[PDB]
């Protein structure tokens, strides 16, 4: 399959002397790292968040980040201070690596400006996004022909340090990343869709890992009209999900929510509706 590590940076430039930097490290969609802007240090969120890396080499990484954040910010401020009507504006960066079975690791470094793609690091070249403006061509030119210390560092971080770190991180967090957390489920009666209609609701909460299957059922017959919400986070590193169905007042009887999740070991949660107001007795 596919596995990745990445850093995100969020730079908000409010005026020529006020900007804000934040960022964070991620194992696919699991956050593993914070950044303390105040002190310029890495916040290690889990007890395995150092991977197999020595404190020295993490401390070297943290200093290389401090220099970068201050330097990138100051260079942006130098350009943009020549026109104060450009403010406010936002730059986002996503940088890291991705491994595919049997391949060399692939590195990425992608930049957005005010919520659209601006430019990206493609092998050893910085390349303006399709529909390249003036801005994006100017920056790539500056990066390709006069910040060569920069490009080499970047290259080596995403192509060699990141994969190495990534694999240490997965090794040390093996237990935690593959753990299983069983969900609970419950029903409720959501808002009336119309005259003699009911909205049936099935909540599923506290599940990990993320993949999950929820349908309304009549016996073996999946109910076509089932609507899956988005899978939303809880604050204890689990997930949440509602599944709804619009039914005739009087067709609800016999219907059930069914949940399959990898933590349940084939023993699906099945909740039958009704006959009380909100799917209870």
């Amino acid at each position: 399959e596919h596995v990745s590590f990445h850093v995100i940076q969020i730079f908000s430039f409010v005026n020529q002397s006020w900007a804000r930097g934040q960022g964070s490290g991620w194992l696919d969609e699991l956050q593993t790292h914070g950044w303390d802007s105040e002190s310029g240090t890495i916040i290690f969120l889990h007890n395995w968040s150092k991977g197999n890396f020595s404190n020295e080499e993490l401390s070297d990484l943290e200093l290389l980040f401090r220099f970068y954040l201050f330097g990138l910010t100051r260079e942006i401020q130098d350009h943009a201070s020549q026109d104060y009507s450009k403010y406010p504006f936002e730059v986002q960066v996503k940088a890291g690596c991705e491994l595919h079975s049997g391949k060399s690791p692939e590195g990425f470094f992608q930049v957005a400006f005010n919520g659209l793609d601006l430019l990206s690091f493609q092998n050893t070249t910085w390349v303006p996004s399709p529909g390249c403006g003036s801005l994006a061509q100017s920056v790539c030119h500056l990066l390709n022909h006069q910040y060569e210390g920069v490009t080499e560092t970047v290259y080596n971080l995403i192509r060699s340090t990141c994969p190495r770190f990534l694999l240490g991180l997965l090794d040390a967090g093996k237990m935690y990343v593959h753990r299983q957390v069983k969900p609970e489920a419950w029903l409720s009666s959501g808002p009336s869709p119309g005259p003699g209609r009911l909205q049936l609701v099935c909540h599923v909460s506290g599940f990990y890992p993320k993949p999950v299957w929820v349908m309304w059922m009549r016996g073996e017959q999946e109910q076509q009209g089932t609507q899956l919400g988005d899978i939303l986070p809880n604050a204890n590193w689990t997930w949440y999900l509602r599944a709804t169905l619009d039914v005739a007042d009087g067709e609800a009887a016999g219907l059930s929510c069914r949940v399959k999740h990898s933590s349940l070991e084939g023993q699906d949660i099945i909740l039958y509706w009704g006959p009380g107001s909100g799917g209870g007795l």
Partner: protein, 99 residues
Amino acid sequence: MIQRTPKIQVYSRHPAENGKSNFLNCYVSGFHPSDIEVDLLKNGERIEKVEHSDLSFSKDWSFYLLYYTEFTPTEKDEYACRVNHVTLSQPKIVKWDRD
């Protein structure tokens, strides 16, 4: 310059049982730029000591994040999430409705 309005979803970690402690969540997502004001209200007054996850963004570069708190529902306590953002002419309130 692109701007995107936040989506706002409010929900509890557990089914609400009056007098049982629980977690109220307000997930704000799909927004741009990142500057945003989020509050949890209890009867229309803001709760202090609200925690939130570190700011992040999706593949389309829009931002998201989770605001949450310990709380204890009762029959006649109303809880909501109030959001302010430059795309919104006025703050937007979404009510926790247990359903």
